[PDB]
Amino acid sequence: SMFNNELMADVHFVVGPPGATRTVPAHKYVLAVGSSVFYAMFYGDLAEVKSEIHIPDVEPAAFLILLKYMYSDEIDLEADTVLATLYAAKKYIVPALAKACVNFLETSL
Amino acid sequence: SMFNNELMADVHFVVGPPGATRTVPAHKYVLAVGSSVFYAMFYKSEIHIPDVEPAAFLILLKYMYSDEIDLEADTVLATLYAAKKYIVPALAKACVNFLETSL
Amino acid sequence: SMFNNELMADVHFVVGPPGATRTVPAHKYVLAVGSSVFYAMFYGDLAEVKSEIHIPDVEPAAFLILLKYMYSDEIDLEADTVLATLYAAKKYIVPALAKACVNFLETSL
Amino acid sequence: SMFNNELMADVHFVVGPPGATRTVPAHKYVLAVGSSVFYAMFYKSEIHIPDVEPAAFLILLKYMYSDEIDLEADTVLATLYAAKKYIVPALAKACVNFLETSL
Ligand SMILES: [K+]
Ligand SMILES: [K+]
């Protein structure tokens, strides 16, 4: 799979709070197709070329769940990370994922 | 008006990331009655909660003193985190309801 | 001055690359009035309440020049930081500052 | 077509932040003729430039091999940084001109 694969990766995200980051390879095409926010960042008028992008306010597990959905259409939520995933989904304007997080929060212990 | 009041306050919370905190006075009785986590804690007088947003903590406390829930789009996720952290189910339910409505 | 003053500060920016950051207090009102990007971040539909905001891709000196302009209308460029200031000005959509950086680059050694 | 070509390459640059680099072959002669900084350097065969964007470095090199300048909005600032770093004034001028036009 291209998800979380260094093969052809044209961007790396350094995700998480300082001292507890994870570096995630990604593909600008898949991200921009899936999100108006990644589109703006990579293809929009104010896009700036950046090999490495920091996302200090997102949890790594959450970011990987978001990207899994953007590559595969699969939603792989877990109780421990669903709230952080909802933050990421709202942040990048991925509403199908946002909705699934809300339903998950409604129906989980 | 005991909410956020230094009068009779027996606990202070230092809330938020170091360098961007807010100190909030509170009353152990009121918190412990609304929360099993605060009960376990109180039953030190300065408590640091660097993982919680001050704005969310204040919304949680207002609920615990007044039973009033006042949510907004910019604070609901952080309030939900706090409500789950302190096990305040009525406030957590209200946040999830707000979120559903906002979809 | 309210510029870079902890008095009434309702946000703190942790500016710069990891290990070389500076924490800058600021006031959401002044920033949102001066920039559609800070407006979006603080007052817009997808605004999320955040005490501390990280800006890993901006230089601290540059960010302080940007904010000085937003508080005071004064532009205080220097050769050593003008390029990083132009990046910040483009990034937050402050065109009067962008223009001054370009003119400065044109007319400096 | 010696630009970005491993054929005869006597230097390799590891360009960009560690973990997000690109390795670019080059020819010391061509670089040294276009730049006082590269002249001083060459007159080791693997050079790390973690402060430069790969895309910008490639635009700089294309200029140095071909005299062609191909700028875009998303790469112009990073190209200007590189052009100033290696003291390539014609490319720096072109970037500032592009920026002026874009205002
Ligand atoms: K699944
Ligand atoms: K001045």
CA distance C100 to D2: 39
Any idea of the CA torsion for A58, A61, A65, A70, to the nearest 10 degrees? 60
- Nearest bound ligand to the CA of residue A69: 1
Residues followed by a break in chain B (C to N exceeding 2.5 Å) are 43
Which residues between 64 and 93 in chain B have a beta carbon less than 8 angstroms from any beta carbon of chain C?
A: 73-75, 77-78
CB B61, CB B83: distance < 8 Å:
no
B16 at the C interface (CB within 8 A)?
yes
Q: Rounded to the nearest whole angstrom, what is the distance from the C-alpha of residue B84 to the centroid of ligand 1?
A: 24
Q: Rounded to the nearest whole angstrom, what is the distance from the C-alpha of residue D36 to the centroid of ligand 1?
A: 57
- Using a 10 angstrom Cβ sphere, with 0-12 exposed, 13-18 middle and 19 or more buried, the burial of residue D101 is exposed
Q: Do the chains contact at D53 and A51, CB–CB below 8 Å?
A: yes
Q: Rounded to the nearest whole angstrom, what is the distance from the C-alpha of residue A71 to the centroid of ligand 1?
A: 13
CA distance B101 to C8: 34
C40 at the A interface (CB within 8 A)?
no
CATH number of the domain located at residue range(s) A1-109 in this protein = 3.30.710.10
Q: Does D touch B (3+ CB pairs < 8 Å)?
A: no
Q: Do the chains contact at A51 and D77, CB–CB below 8 Å?
A: no
D8 at the C interface (CB within 8 A)?
no
| Pairing between β-strand C22-26 and β-strand B46-49 as defined by DSSP bridges | unpaired
The vertex-D70 CA angle with A48 and D84, nearest 5°, equals 70
Which of B52, B53, B60, B74 is best to mutate for the C interface (most C CBs within 10 A)?
B74
CB C85, CB C65: distance < 8 Å:
yes
CB B15, CB B23: distance < 8 Å:
yes
Distance from CA of A80 to the nearest CA of C (A): 21
As a whole number of Å, the end-to-end CA separation of chain A is: 32
Q: Does C touch A (3+ CB pairs < 8 Å)?
A: yes
What tokens were used for B57? Answer: 């903590």
Q: Any idea where the domains of chain D sit in the sequence?
A: 1-103
CA distance C22 to D20: 25
Q: Closest Cα partner for B84 from B103, B29, B41, B76?
A: B76
Instruction: Please report all neighbours of B, defined by 3+ CB atom pairs within 8 A.
Output: A, C
C12 contacts in B (CB within 8 Å)? 17, 19-20
β-sheet bridge partners, residue A55: A15
Q: Does C touch D (3+ CB pairs < 8 Å)?
A: yes
Ligand 1 ion: Cβ-proximal residues, 5 Å cutoff: A 74, 76
C44: which residues sit within 8 A by CB, 6+ positions away? none
C98 contacts in D (CB within 8 Å)? 103
Q: Closest Cα partner for B25 from B40, B10, B35?
A: B10
Q: Closest Cα partner for A11 from D14, D54, D4?
A: D54
Of C83, C87, C98, the CB nearest to D103: C98
CA distance B52 to B72: 16
Which CB contacts under 8 angstroms, 24+ apart, belong to D21-30?
D21/A51, D21/D50, D21/D54, D22/A51, D22/D54, D24/D54, D24/D57, D24/D58, D24/D61, D26/D61, D27/D2, D30/D2, D30/D64, D30/D65
- Experiment used for this model: X-ray
Concatenating the DSSP letter of every residue in C1-43 gives --TT--TT--EEEEESSTTS-EEEEE-HHHHHHH-HHHHHHHT
C45 contacts in B (CB within 8 Å)? 73
The letter for the amino acid at B91 is L
- Nearest bound ligand to the CA of residue A72: 1
- Give the CATH fold of the D1-103 domain: Potassium Channel Kv1.1; Chain A (3.30.710)
